[PDB]
Design an enzyme around this catalytic site. Structure first.
Site, PDB file in Angstrom:
ATOM      1  N   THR A  86       0.755  -1.210  -0.137  1.00 14.66           N
ATOM      2  CA  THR A  86       0.182  -0.194  -0.014  1.00 14.66           C
ATOM      3  C   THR A  86       1.098   1.275  -0.203  1.00 14.66           C
ATOM      4  O   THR A  86       0.579   2.418  -0.778  1.00 14.66           O
ATOM      5  CB  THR A  86      -1.134  -0.084   1.180  1.00 14.66           C
ATOM      6  OG1 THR A  86      -1.721   0.949   0.956  1.00 14.66           O
ATOM      7  CG2 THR A  86      -0.213   0.089   2.632  1.00 14.66           C
ATOM      8  N   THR A 121      12.552  -7.996   5.476  1.00 14.26           N
ATOM      9  CA  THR A 121      11.377  -8.173   6.318  1.00 14.26           C
ATOM     10  C   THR A 121      10.431  -9.033   5.321  1.00 14.26           C
ATOM     11  O   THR A 121       9.716  -9.913   5.835  1.00 14.26           O
ATOM     12  CB  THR A 121      10.650  -7.097   6.683  1.00 14.26           C
ATOM     13  OG1 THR A 121      11.629  -6.295   7.631  1.00 14.26           O
ATOM     14  CG2 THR A 121       9.330  -7.370   7.223  1.00 14.26           C
ATOM     15  N   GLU A 160      14.629  27.400   0.082  1.00  8.02           N
ATOM     16  CA  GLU A 160      15.939  27.458  -0.026  1.00  8.02           C
ATOM     17  C   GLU A 160      16.638  26.145  -0.055  1.00  8.02           C
ATOM     18  O   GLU A 160      17.565  26.121  -0.702  1.00  8.02           O
ATOM     19  CB  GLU A 160      16.388  28.385   1.407  1.00  8.02           C
ATOM     20  CG  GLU A 160      15.834  29.602   1.420  1.00  8.02           C
ATOM     21  CD  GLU A 160      16.069  30.612   0.476  1.00  8.02           C
ATOM     22  OE1 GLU A 160      17.528  30.634   0.055  1.00  8.02           O
ATOM     23  OE2 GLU A 160      15.337  31.776   0.323  1.00  8.02           O
ATOM     24  N   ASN A 216      11.662   5.871  15.364  1.00 10.66           N
ATOM     25  CA  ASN A 216      10.905   6.789  14.793  1.00 10.66           C
ATOM     26  C   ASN A 216      10.908   7.982  15.851  1.00 10.66           C
ATOM     27  O   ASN A 216      10.407   9.102  15.149  1.00 10.66           O
ATOM     28  CB  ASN A 216       9.137   6.147  15.076  1.00 10.66           C
ATOM     29  CG  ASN A 216       8.816   5.097  14.270  1.00 10.66           C
ATOM     30  OD1 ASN A 216       9.774   4.876  13.303  1.00 10.66           O
ATOM     31  ND2 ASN A 216       7.830   4.454  14.600  1.00 10.66           N
ATOM     32  N   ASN A 264      16.886   1.346   7.901  1.00 11.23           N
ATOM     33  CA  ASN A 264      16.694   0.875   9.303  1.00 11.23           C
ATOM     34  C   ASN A 264      18.007   0.388   9.927  1.00 11.23           C
ATOM     35  O   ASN A 264      18.071   0.429  11.033  1.00 11.23           O
ATOM     36  CB  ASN A 264      15.340  -0.090   9.445  1.00 11.23           C
ATOM     37  CG  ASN A 264      14.180   0.416   9.236  1.00 11.23           C
ATOM     38  OD1 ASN A 264      14.168   1.814   9.220  1.00 11.23           O
ATOM     39  ND2 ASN A 264      13.316  -0.245   8.866  1.00 11.23           N
TER      40      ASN A 264
END
Ligand code: GTP
Ligand code: GDP
Ligand code: GDP
Ligand code: MG
Lengths: 430, 44, 442, 48, 430
Positions: free
Chosen positions: C144, C178, C253, C227, C205
């Protein structure tokens, strides 16, 4: 996202009874059907397997089918039997006679319409339907013939859903019935066309699990059905609880099956160990992975050491770090590199779920797609070809109406399945 | 019909992994740790 | 000054939870959205406006949507601790997942969900003074995130046009993995991301795991730690919009200074004072040591080594009590080093920013409290190594059509694999060509 | 002075959570030992 | 840096039981397995021999192997027996028959895979593995045959680690079995190829220690196994506690063995003294060195006065001065200079550890590489040659399957080992 279960024949009804005991315990449903649980986490996904009946009650989404009511009366007499909806019990008036052809052609067509009417009644009640789950043995009579008949009709009527089967298959070491090879060959012919994913278990492997790992002095069929109910309830665990890395039956199928015929899997569940011995070894992700890959813990006679892993999947239940899972899967893939198929860079999928089964700190379920399964089909084929050359007991099946050409077709299709597995096994890259 | 989702309590959220360490920030603190953050705008 | 946040799928919603936890604690908004009266100083500048809008009764609500195809993560957000902060319309959920198929997200299922998403984004964009970008969080490894992220970026790019879209992207790590089908989804994602993103930040990761093991003292990290680091980085980059400073830097910028040619927009990110409280008392933390820290490859949040390439541009963000003379002395010291090399067409390799607001400390957090920090995003030819490694695994699987029948059944032409693989080959050749010195000697 | 005060407070809070976690682990181990001792009583059922 | 122990046969299991009692006492482990010690110095190196199981417990890294379970049931019944992990006990269903060939070829190959599986499971769990340690007798049946089998397999699988053995060798006078020479000759042939360092003990020397030094009226095998457990726990003591001059099994091996075949050593332990005499003599470094070199205190029948020292090692436990150690080793080397090989300028290594064995102020353990060890092999070889010329008892071994050529090979290899030791004894500078 709700699953509908179908239980067929004696083995199927017994396994179903133990499964619905395990699930009712996990969701805290009293044997009267009243919710008596102690956390909202139990309630918030109960819809997945139960429908709600009025003022409190829950009903289990299952259809029971058998050709002689003796077993059905036994299940109604069991401790949870009252929970089942009466209209969901379908039975005939004369037995399968251990004959695939009777179960498929004569009594099958007699009962089959009432089963499709009940499954449709159950299916159309769902707000969104996920796959069906079917339990049966391949060596029996009504289980094999009527189960595969029903599977074919449901695949015609619901081709976009998932069709999942768990199946018990006759052990060469110990048969309970003489005509097992015919029923097994015809059923595998039906399954390889019809099924999306099929798991196979040898009763010999469950006996060796019980005696070596659990050291039971006097095991009974209730223990074997407890191992099966444990795995059945484990595959669906990510459907019904939160977690750090969600997973789904469709996601498992997409990651496990490289080509559509290769959908037969080995099963294992790792933290089986008696509570007394458990004090001598603490739970940890390395410990679970080492038991998980130990052939002592695999539920099929074939051993992985004679084959190679195409793919594997791990579903973890419990509070654990993702780093430890990832690094364990890397270390196992790197250290044992000869047993993993080389044109895939990583063969193992992992998944992590927060809520363990009650009374265990951690658990993992393992699904493996391994070429050593070629062994089960080859052993059956030798026994069949031995029987067919002499036209063994064949008049029973031909008298029902079968053409001899079906047996040669089913043998040829199974032989091609063995060949496709055998070509990918070839350990040498060549 | 779809029943609306029921809100969780404090101990129910604590069961999972994300929610437990969110509530650790929210509740499990000393008196001195709430002073750590401050505004220094327009001061230098 | 406004920004709209779009969170898609599992990683994007969980990273959103960490981000909004941080932004609440930094501004001082309570979990119910009610700003407390004791946090007042007599006047209250509209600094929240970048991330919050007011109703009129004084409740705060944030400018974000959470997008998922499976219910579990978003209903967890709806039923979690921040229930009253978010408007329920913002939390959009479908019926069934994209099953790790980019094809399932893009062709069959995402077309159903996409029009509600676009109507919500419209509802956000009409209620602002001037929108100055979208922040997007996703992983390219899942179904997704790849399929709906591509479809949504295409529609956003047609409807809003020139308006900027900035993506934070979790790429598949070079040996941690994974799922089996990660290469197909990552190739097709990168194919969509090339045309329809203004700056793309690359994350792995495995690098954040290495950084949390080596620098922090954490034996068993989990996604909430990663996170929180990502949230800290985003807060550092967006702090330039929200607080007073000596040298401000508007999001335009960044694009003007970092991107030399319109395809060369993928940047590496690192953060300096990742340090523990017990560690914090052993070291001074002056400008020059943390500036030296951000250039070591042990500091990077993506698994690439920049010593194997050449820098094209660097953007250095300093926040807290720092003085420009120390920044200049640090940059001149970096420039002196022999293992740091710039392409000869980029002589003035650095852009600097200096903001007075120090980084916020989170009560349960693992970083120490520090008076100053620096954050860097930089464009370097080393990125060519990540694509080559993705492409080898794609070539390995696709030579035998290992899984293609799922994708082909879900509405896709077989040709799309070869097109994407040729586009990534052309991107590799672009990074080879840009780094080639031009000689004009008789 | 401000920065040293903040760091000292953070260290003290870390110590507090560490002690609480150790207490929880000790309680869990005691419960496990009791439950292991409980299952030994199933040896009398086989005898009888 | 963790050691894994292997105990094989009756002698091995009994020595293991006394060793794990002494080590568990020294580290303060209760017979339930719970740590109850009173200083951090005890805890900080417990990992070297114990793994941690869940809720407190520690388990000892040892594998117990035997061919008939009588002994194994006796050790499980002992006072510390419960600490051992049940799965670590490996036993067969029929005996070794006191026959080397059965133990090596017929029941050996039947069991060996399960022992290798357990040893690998234990080894691969360590974060960094130090050498293995094996205790067994050569005169027995399963000890010699399966022990040397396992040593060969472990040397194939882990060639970069250390292999250490403590070994009991048949007395020339106190025989328990007639066919001892065959089992000894084949086992020494296996050891000289496979082992890294091997220590040899004569039961006659333990009897002379007990009767002459300790003046025990009625000694039992518990005393002999206590002396052995004392030396065994002493060689590794510097591995697991701090000290002023640390030492390690690898450092002992590198300093003791000049050439790779010369790895057979004599052992002694000094502060041995009878309870009646103990009131009469205080501990001091001169007393330990004098007892340490007295041949009464050496655990082999060969006497150093008939040979020459190639190398020696001393491991000291206790709080003591380095000056006294250095000056004692110089004074002993200078005064007895004819007994030390002249082409090595200093033959003795010293090491100092702060923490003594419980209830002693100071102790030293001695490892010696002396050519008089050649006398044991020559005496055993004569009796073997006496039996073989007459083909004594040969039909048992030939019926198991052995070629007569193995016996001539083993005899030739042992004779060459004796010749090589004799050559280094009589070497000169020229
Ligand atoms: N940093 C971080 N990465 C994550 C997190 N969750 C998943 N990932 C990574 O993202 C990839 C998996 O993508 P997902 O987000 O699970 O895919 P999805 O968006 O859920 O798509 P579907 O499975 O179809 O629902 C893998 O590389 C994971 O390592 C997270 O919480 N934090
Ligand atoms: N695991 C398990 N296997 C069973 C059980 N009952 C029967 N079986 C096996 O299933 C096969 C017999 O098939 P059966 O169920 O009688 O076929 P049916 O007559 O068509 O119902 C044999 O291999 C039995 O060992 C059970 O309760 N559990
Ligand atoms: N020193 C010592 N020798 C022992 C012990 N137990 C047995 N022995 C000797 O070892 C030899 C017997 O070997 P044994 O262990 O019975 O062989 P197995 O039957 O294969 O286990 C004899 O010489 C015994 O005297 C012991 O505890 N200590
Ligand atoms: Mg997902």
């Amino acid at each position: 996202r709700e699953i509908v279960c179908v239980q067929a024949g004696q083995c199927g009804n017994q396994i179903g009874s133990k499964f619905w005991e395990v699930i009712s315990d996990e969701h805290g449903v009293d044997p009267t059907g009243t919710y008596q649980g102690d956390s909202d986490l139990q309630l918030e996904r109960i819809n997945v397997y139960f429908d709600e009946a009025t003022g409190g009650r829950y009903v289990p989404r299952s259809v029971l089918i058998d050709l002689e009511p003796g077993t059905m009366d036994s299940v109604r007499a069991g401790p949870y039997g009252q929970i089942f909806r009466p209209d969901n019990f379908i039975f005939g008036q004369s037995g399968a006679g251990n004959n695939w052809a009777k179960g498929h052609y004569t009594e099958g067509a007699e009962l089959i319409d009432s089963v499709l009417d009940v499954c449709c009644k159950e299916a159309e009640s769902c707000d969104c339907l996920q796959g069906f789950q079917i339990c049966h043995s391949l060596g029996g009579g009504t289980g094999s013939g009527m189960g595969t008949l029903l599977i074919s009709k449901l695949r015609e009527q619901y081709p976009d859903r998932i069709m999942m089967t768990f199946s018990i298959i006759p052990s060469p070491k110990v048969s309970d019935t003489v005509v097992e090879p015919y029923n097994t060959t015809l059923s595998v012919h039906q399954l390889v066309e019809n099924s999306d994913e099929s798991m196979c278990i040898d009763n010999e492997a469950l006996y060796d699990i019980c005696f070596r790992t659990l050291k039971l002095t006097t095991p009974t069929f209730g223990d074997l059905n407890h191992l099966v109910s444990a795995v059945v309830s484990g595959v669906t665990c990510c459907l019904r609880f939160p977690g750090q890395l969600n997973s789904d039956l469709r996601k498992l199928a997409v990651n496990l099956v490289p080509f559509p015929r290769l959908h037969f899997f080995m099963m294992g569940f790792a933290p089986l160990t008696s509570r007394g011995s458990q004090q001598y070894r603490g739970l940890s992700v390395p410990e679970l992975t080492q038991q998980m890959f130990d052939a002592k813990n695999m539920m099929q006679a074939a051993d992985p050491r004679h084959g190679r892993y195409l793919t594997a999947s791990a579903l973890f239940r419990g509070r654990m770090s993702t780093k430890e899972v990832d690094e364990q899967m890397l270390n196992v893939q790197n250290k044992n590199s000869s047993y993993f198929i080389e044109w895939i860079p990583n063969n193992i999928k992992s998944s992590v779920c927060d809520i363990p089964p009650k009374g265990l700190k951690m658990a993992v379920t393992f699904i493996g797609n391994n070429t050593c399964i070629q062994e089960m089909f080859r052993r059956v084929g030798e026994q069949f070809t031995l029987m067919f050359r002499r036209k063994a007991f064949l008049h029973w099946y031909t008298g029902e109406g079968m053409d001899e050409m079906e047996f040669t077709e089913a043998e040829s299709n199974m032989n091609d399945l063995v060949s496709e597995y055998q070509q990918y096994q070839d350990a040498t890259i060549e | 019909e779809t029943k609306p989702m029921k809100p969780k309590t404090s101990e129910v959220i604590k069961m999972t992994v994300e929610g437990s360490m969110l509530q650790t920030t929210l509740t499990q603190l000393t008196d001195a740790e709430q002073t750590l953050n401050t505004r220094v705008d327009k001061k230098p | 000054r406004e920004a709209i946040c779009i969170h898609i799928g599992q990683a994007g919603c969980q990273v959103g939870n960490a981000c909004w936890e941080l932004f609440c604690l930094e501004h001082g908004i309570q979990p119910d959205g009610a700003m407390p009266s004791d946090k007042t100083i007599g006047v209250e500048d509209d600094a929240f406006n970048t991330f919050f809008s007011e109703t009129g009764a004084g409740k705060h609500v944030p400018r974000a949507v959470f997008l998922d195809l499976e219910p579990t993560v978003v209903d967890e957000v709806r039923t979690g601790t921040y229930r009253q902060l978010f408007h329920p319309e913002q939390l959009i959920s479908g019926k069934e997942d994209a099953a790790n198929n980019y094809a399932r997200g893009h062709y069959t299922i995402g077309k159903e969900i996409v029009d509600l998403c676009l109507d919500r984004i419209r509802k956000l964009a009409d209620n602002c003074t001037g929108l100055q970008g979208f922040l997007v969080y996703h992983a390219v490894g899942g179904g997704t995130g790849s399929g709906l992220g591509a479809l949504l970026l295409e529609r956003l790019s047609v409807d809003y046009g020139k308006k900027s879209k900035l993506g934070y992207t979790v790429y598949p790590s070079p040996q941690v993995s994974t799922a089996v089908v990660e290469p197909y989804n990552s190739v097709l994602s990168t194919h969509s991301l090339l045309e329809h993103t203004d700056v793309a930040a690359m994350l792995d990761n495995e690098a954040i795991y290495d950084l949390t093991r080596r620098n922090l003292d954490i034996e068993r990290p989990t996604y909430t730690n990663l996170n929180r680091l990502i949230g800290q980085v985003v807060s550092s980059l967006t702090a330039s919009l929200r607080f007073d400073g000596a040298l401000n830097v508007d999001l335009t910028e960044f694009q003007t200074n970092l991107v030399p040619y319109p395809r060369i927009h993928f940047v590496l990110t690192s953060y300096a004072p990742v340090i523990s409280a017990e560690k914090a008392y052993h070291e001074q933390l002056s400008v020059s040591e943390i500036s030296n820290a951000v250039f070591e490859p042990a500091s990077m949040m993506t698994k690439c080594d920049p010593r194997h390439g050449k820098y094209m541009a660097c953007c250095l963000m300093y926040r807290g009590d720092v003085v420009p003379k120390d920044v200049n002395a640090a940059v001149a010291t970096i420039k002196t080093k022999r293992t740091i090399q710039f392409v000869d067409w980029s002589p003035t390799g650095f852009k600097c920013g200096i903001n007075y607001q120090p980084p916020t400390v989170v009560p349960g957090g693992d970083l120490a409290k520090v008076q100053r920090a620096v954050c860097m995003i930089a464009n370097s030819t080393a990125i060519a190594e990540v694509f080559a490694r993705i492409d080898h695994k794609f070539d390995l699987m696709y030579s035998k059509r290992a899984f293609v029948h799922w994708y082909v059944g879900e509405g896709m032409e077989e040709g799309e694999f070869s097109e994407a693989r040729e586009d990534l080959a052309a991107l590799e050749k672009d990074y080879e060509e840009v780094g080639a010195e031009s000689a004009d000697m008789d | 002075q401000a920065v040293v005060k903040a760091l000292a407070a953070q260290v003290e809070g870390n110590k507090m959570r560490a002690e609480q976690h150790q207490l929880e682990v000790k309680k869990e181990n005691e419960a496990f030992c009791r439950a292991v001792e409980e299952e030994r009583a199933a040896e009398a059922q086989k005898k009888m």
